[PDB]
Design a protein. Structure first.
Lengths: 85, 57
């Protein structure tokens, strides 16, 4: 009809409602993120925890970490047979 | 002068000179222009500020 403001209508809606939702998820995701792998908390030792944080730790995760249980139970069971048999 | 007995070239020129302003211009845009400018400028400023804020975010 006459003059208007075709571009200035970005007030009524920002570009990309789906991109806006994605970016809003991105802001919460990236902001509420550790600076560089923060909050590790690996070490622990209290009676059994000295074995948990050492033997159930994934630095090795080899076969001996489970085999310690077998060796210990064998130590218990040999005395069990000695007191039993 | 090419019309020796026109007897109306005087009258025709009289009407011509007296019809110097057949009418006026119409620059009636004095508040419509202001309102259009206000709406456009506020909307565009909101858009530009939103764009800058999006850039910063």
């Amino acid at each position: 009809v006459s003059t208007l403001i075709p571009p200035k209508v970005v007030s009524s809606k920002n570009i990309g409602s789906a991109p806006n939702a994605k970016r809003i998820a991105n802001v919460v995701h990236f902001y509420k993120s550790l600076p560089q792998g923060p909050a590790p908390a690996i070490k622990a030792n209290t009676r059994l925890a000295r074995y948990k944080a050492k033997y159930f730790d994934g630095d090795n995760a080899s076969g001996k970490p489970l085999w310690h249980f077998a060796l210990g139970i064998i130590a218990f069971g040999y005395s069990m047979e000695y007191y039993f048999h | 002068s090419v019309l020796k007995n026109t007897s109306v070239i005087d009258k025709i020129e009289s009407y011509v000179k007296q019809y110097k302003p057949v009418k006026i211009d119409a620059s009636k845009q004095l508040q419509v222009i202001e309102s259009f400018e206000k709406h456009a400028m506020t909307n565009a400023k909101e858009t530009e500020s939103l764009v800058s804020k999006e850039l910063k975010d």
